[PDB]
Design a protein around this ligand. Structure first.
Ligand SMILES: Cc1ncc(COP(=O)(O)O)c(/C=N/[C@@H](CO)C(=O)O)c1O
Ligand SMILES: O=P(O)(O)OCCNS(=O)(=O)c1ccc(OC(F)(F)F)cc1
Ligand SMILES: [Cl-]
Ligand SMILES: [Cl-]
Ligand SMILES: [Cl-]
Ligand SMILES: [Cl-]
Ligand SMILES: [Cl-]
Ligand SMILES: [Cl-]
Ligand SMILES: [Cl-]
Ligand SMILES: [Cl-]
Ligand SMILES: [Cl-]
Ligand SMILES: [Cs+]
Ligand SMILES: [Cs+]
Lengths: 268, 396
């Protein structure tokens, strides 16, 4: 399919950035996770990034470590996550769905088979957090054979060769990393990224989404102003889940308010 | 792009977040440079000799082989400063950190031996050391934690995941991913992303080099086999390296069999796990059917790494090295035997290697064989564990 291509073209027509939340599938349980995701969409999410619970999420800070742990406490497995993904797609025809994976979950039962299952359930992209461009070949090849966009990371300290590699090999979107370190709302990016954004465009890269430490409307607007196609926010969303575990009602209300405000910040 | 092959056959690689690739490239370059630098080599040799106490003895153990045609030597890494082989490579890695202009050290530890080694090297060389340790390990290793703290290191309990060594490994990499400009990650075994399997081997290879010289002097020939326990693989690859091209010399690695392979409660992924991708490498793993990483189990705290170094998986695949397992009970019999018959208290980790050598001897007592066991650590740390087992048995 062309879900990212179609989304970015439509957003371009509206002079609009994309707002893309991340959550962990099955946090804090399958049924509540499904409701969380539908709320994110209803409140204005343009695309989703969805994590499969993994034992060793070594690119994630404590907020998302804890989301993984909550999903495990609820007995969530990769198989159940794929059931969830199938249902999410069955409800929502056009929203791009990206997975955040770790390599072992992709390799476990065969790389090709992993991407074939993604295609079957209607996933649009896969980002494997612990696979750098240098190791990407079997992942990106399997992705493209199954109509899945392989998402590459452009770090702030990217050299020209890396920019050219990410631009060439990637599809869907280019992940524009805000800063070094791991996921977390408590650490805001401190580097201007407009030069990287400009070079990616020169090299015909997939449109850039800025991610890591995005927790506020002003950061969404800043990403758009810098030339990015949009912004991803994970920890700030997951914090709302964590804060409101005892009140599913208040949780959904606060998620809606937050997503609405963040999406508003993307608009022309 | 790298200077050296990051793989041993299909095993190894550099499976880290993109943000960490410059750190790995920098470390590889610094290592390759250091290996050609006579000043670096002289500084490393000076520390190994005058601080750590190299060379280590090669002890002939006559009582335990009496009446058989086995001749058994122990390579005495138990006598190194710190009480285990871990000291050798931390001194080299500390010098690499300095070479790169870094003044902070990050390390992971399970049993606490690597943490202690990292702390002592950091104290000596004026580096600020922070050590990640799973909270469950912190609770059960209060002596080692206190040793690390006495030597000025910060010990940071890790509560995520299973709160054990794999979780400490993750936390070290998380830290490094945001601190590599100022801090070096002093990884504690011959595993992880390239270039660590290579660096750790080269900074432990004096074990095998000395053993070769010592056995030639004493016996006038190479050993029939050298035998070492395998957690992550550092002591074993240190013993094996200099003998790899001596194809008559057997290389035997002993993984922990725990309660028995059949029980699933073991730490023997090379022979009884499944290849996965984790901790920056493609290697045999302890893992669930759906690919979640699992803990290793052993009576011995230090054989807890839930994977194995990629060079071991490679040497196995081509048939150069052979890997076996030894159960908790076998390791315990070997521990008691060495204490009573040689007056040496061995680490429970290397008691696995000794147990396998004793099996080689006892199974075929009229087979002429010259064996070396790598005694990678002393067992003072283990007398409480052993006491408690013997008491529960009604042996005492
Ligand atoms: C006394 C001793 N012998 C063998 C090994 C096994 O390690 P290799 O296979 O030689 O790398 C260890 C390991 N210890 C680690 C993991 O807990 C640690 O201290 O952090 C050990 O402490
Ligand atoms: O808002 P934050 O700071 O929590 O960041 C959101 C992160 N969620 S994600 O799926 O985009 C994401 C993307 C990349 C990650 O690691 C990698 F860069 F190494 F690949 C980890 C998570
Ligand atoms: Cl596989
Ligand atoms: Cl799967
Ligand atoms: Cl601003
Ligand atoms: Cl705006
Ligand atoms: Cl090469
Ligand atoms: Cl390869
Ligand atoms: Cl032989
Ligand atoms: Cl053989
Ligand atoms: Cl014989
Ligand atoms: Cs003998
Ligand atoms: Cs092992």
């Amino acid at each position: 399919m062309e879900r990212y291509e179609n989304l970015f073209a439509q957003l371009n027509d509206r002079r609009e950035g994309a707002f893309v939340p991340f959550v962990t599938l099955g946090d804090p349980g399958i049924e509540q996770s499904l409701k969380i995701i539908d709320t994110l969409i209803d409140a204005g999410a343009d695309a989703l990034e969805l994590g499969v619970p993994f034992s060793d999420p070594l690119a994630d800070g404590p907020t998302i470590q804890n989301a993984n742990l909550r999903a495990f406490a609820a007995g969530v497995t990769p198989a159940q996550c794929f059931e969830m993904l199938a249902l999410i797609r069955e409800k929502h025809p056009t929203i791009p769905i990206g997975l955040l994976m770790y390599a072992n979950l992709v390799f476990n039962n065969g790389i090709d088979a992993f991407y074939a299952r993604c295609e079957q359930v209607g996933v649009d992209s896969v980002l494997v957090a612990d696979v750098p461009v240098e190791e990407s070949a079997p992942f990106r090849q399997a992705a493209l054979r199954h109509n899945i966009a392989p998402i590459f990371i452009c770090p702030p300290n990217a050299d020209d060769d890396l920019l050219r590699q990410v631009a060439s090999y990637g599809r869907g979107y280019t992940y524009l990393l805000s800063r070094s370190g791991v996921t977390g709302a408590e650490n805001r990016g401190a580097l201007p990224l407009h030069h990287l954004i400009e070079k990616l465009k020169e090299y015909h890269a997939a449109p850039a989404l800025q991610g890591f430490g995005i927790s506020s409307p002003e950061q969404v607007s800043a990403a758009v102003r810098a030339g990015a196609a949009g912004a991803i926010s994970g920890s700030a969303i997951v914090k709302i889940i964590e804060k409101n575990l005892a009140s599913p009602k208040q949780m959904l209300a606060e998620l809606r308010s937050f997503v609405s405000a963040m999406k508003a910040a993307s608009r022309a | 792009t790298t200077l050296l092959n990051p793989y041993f056959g299909e095993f190894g690689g550099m499976y880290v977040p993109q943000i960490l690739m410059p750190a790995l490239n920098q470390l590889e370059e610094a290592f390759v440079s250091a290996q050609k630098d006579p000043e670096f080599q002289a500084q490393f040799a000076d520390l190994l000799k005058n601080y750590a106490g190299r060379p280590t003895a090669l002890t002939k153990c006559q009582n335990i082989t009496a009446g058989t045609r086995t001749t058994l030597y122990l390579k005495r890494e138990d006598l190194l400063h710190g009480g285990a082989h871990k000291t050798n490579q931390v001194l080299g890695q500390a010098l690499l950190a300095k070479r790169m202009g870094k003044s902070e050290i990050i390390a992971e530890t399970g049993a606490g031996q690597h943490g202690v080694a990292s702390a002592l090297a950091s104290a000596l060389l004026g580096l600020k050391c922070r050590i990640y340790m799973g909270a469950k390990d912190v609770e059960r290793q209060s002596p080692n934690v206190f040793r690390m703290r006495l030597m000025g290191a910060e010990v940071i309990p890790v509560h995520s995941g299973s709160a054990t060594l794999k979780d400490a490994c993750n936390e070290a990499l998380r830290d490094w991913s945001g601190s590599y400009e100022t801090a070096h990650y002093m990884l504690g075994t011959a595993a992880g992303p390239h270039p660590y399997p290579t660096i750790v081997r080269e900074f432990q290879r004096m074990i095998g080099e000395e053993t070769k010289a010592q056995i030639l002097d004493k016996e006038g020939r190479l050993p029939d086999a050298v035998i070492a326990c395998v957690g992550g693989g550092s002591n074993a690859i240190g013993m094996f390296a200099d003998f790899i091209n001596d194809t008559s010399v057997g290389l035997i690695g002993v993984e922990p069999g725990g309660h028995g392979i059949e029980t699933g409660e073991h730490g023997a992924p090379l022979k009884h796990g499944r290849v996965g991708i984790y901790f920056g490498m493609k290697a045999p793993m302890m893992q669930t059917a759906d690919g979640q990483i699992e803990e290793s189990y052993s009576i011995s705290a230090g054989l807890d790494f839930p994977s194995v170094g990629p060079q071991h998986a490679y040497l196995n695949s081509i048939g150069r090295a052979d890997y076996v397992s030894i159960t908790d009970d076998e390791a315990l019999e070997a521990f008691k035997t060495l204490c009573r018959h040689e007056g040496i208290i061995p680490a429970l980790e290397s008691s696995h290697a000794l147990a396998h050598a004793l099996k080689m001897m006892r199974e075929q007592p009229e087979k002429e064989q010259l064996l070396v066991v790598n005694l990678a650590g002393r067992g003072d740390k283990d007398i409480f564990t052993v006491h408690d087992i013997l008491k529960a048995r009604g042996e005492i």
